[PDB]
């Protein structure tokens, strides 16, 4: 009984990370669009949580099944692969890619101001070195942590999806194994539901 | 001849297919510039009458048509005479060659050439997107193979269906014209019987007339 | 002097050609041979003349054997011929691109090529096919056949690939579209269609 509730700009990457996870576990949830003064807020009965990645993990743990276990916290080695590539997103991939989408989308559209090209070109060069590594990893496996989708892959969706709305979306075609992995994600039923809540 | 009406943007390849056919049969017509696709919301009449959103729309008195190839053929049939018979439906053998090379355009040539037009022109102009060069290279390699067959065919005949211009050749003009406006025009130089055929088509008065109409707007 | 069709009889492009020959009551013989050992799949020989490409051949057949009882192209009636033409184009560029990859994924790849069914291609094609069938449902509630109140080349073109779609796990999708199923059963009750359907079951 009782769905959970996610309070936040229902197009933010922060909310998306959480909603994507809820969909993958089949949790009934409600999104209440609100902008505030940790971007997403989360209520489960009396319990109230903030912060994207912490709420995602709470969700994946709470609705974890033998069949849908996206953290693999019971298999040490699989959980280490989930964890390392979640860290790669947070400290290597996203810092190179998220400025591209903040400059090319949110700076003109939302927080109206011109697109800074020095930062975009620098982020593109760093992203290119990131994707080189991704290209090798995803030649060995279909997903980041191995041959099973996981939190690590899901963590990549929200910002990449907006990157795929910049004039640079085609950069991934220069890396056919990453492209295919991206395409593998975009076809998951749960991803396209969340993808439909986005696009400025 | 109560002038027939074509509805769509004249820059569009599907509009150009139809107006080239009208020009070649000498028919009176006018082109009403309007982009129904850009209109997300429609009347119940439109969606019942054109549920697939075929382009252009064509009006001949009380008759309403969509889909450029069907319209083009309607126009070639309606205004056909002994001196301009672009379908040859009288000659079973000639009609078969018109049909054959119309299909090659539809399923072999246009699929290889048209992505280059979108990547190199329609995208970095009317949508702002840069040119996906991975798409361009794959398409050029596909197109080179196609053009080897056309090269051979047009060394035996001046036109695709034989030794007479037909619907088959007219079908190739709209996308190829845009292709020839890109830096990739140079590719035809390696297929001298294809280039000579292209030049023969570009020299036709009806084609020069429709080519003039394929310029982007202004304001 | 019967005409000759060269290709595998189970092929969709052979079936397109032989359905037309059946409907026009022409005498012909099929010569099984896989000529790829453009490469248009059926080869067709009418004594002096030799054609390729199944749609050009089908129209040649319908043209040559044209009678008043059997006029499957309606070229003497500009308006009827335009409806034949539009719905032949919908097949070629809208209907067949949505439906044929299901036939290939569920049927051709496992059985002939020896490759399992890619469910991602199937699901994506199913989503496309559903939107197409919505429009066909609307069209076939207004008319018994795609071009109007008469069977035409346009209906004949849909037979080969749809026949194979009906052998996939997704055949039942057509029940969700009652006017289309009603149209499909009308085609399946035609005698010429019954004959060609029997030729499309290889060992
Ligand atoms: Na066609
Ligand atoms: Na097509």
Author numbering:
A (entry chain C): 1 to 37, 54 to 216
B (entry chain A): 1 to 219
C (entry chain B): 2 to 38, 52 to 217
Quoted from the paper:
The structures of sh101 and sh155 enzyme variants were resolved at 1.87 and 2.00 Å resolution and compared to the wild-type AmGSTF enzyme structure that has been recently reported. Sh101 and sh155 were crystallized with two and three molecules in the asymmetric unit, respectively. The sequence between the β2 and β3 strands where the α2 helix is located exhibits significant distortion due to high flexibility. In sh155, high flexibility was observed in the same region in two of the molecules, while in the third one sufficient density was found that enabled the building of the entire loop between β2 and β3. The variants sh101 and sh155 possess 11 and 17 mutations respectively, compared to the wild-type AmGSTF. Among the selected enzymes, sh101 and sh155 exhibited the highest improvement in kcat values (185.9 ± 1.8 min−1 and 197.7 ± 3.2 min−1, respectively), corresponding to an approximately 5-fold improvement, compared to the wild-type AmGSTF enzyme (35.9 ± 1.7 min−1). In particular, the Tm values of sh101 and sh155 enzyme variants were significantly increased by 8.3 and 5.2 °C compared to the parent enzyme AmGSTF. Inspection of the crystal structures of sh101 and sh155 shows that Lys93 can form a new salt bridge with Asp62 of the opposite subunit. However, it was estimated that sh49, sh155 and sh168 exhibited up to 3-fold lower IC50 values than the crop GSTFs. For example, the enzyme variant sh155 could potentially be a promising candidate for the development of a butachlor biosensor, since it combines low IC50 values with high catalytic activity.
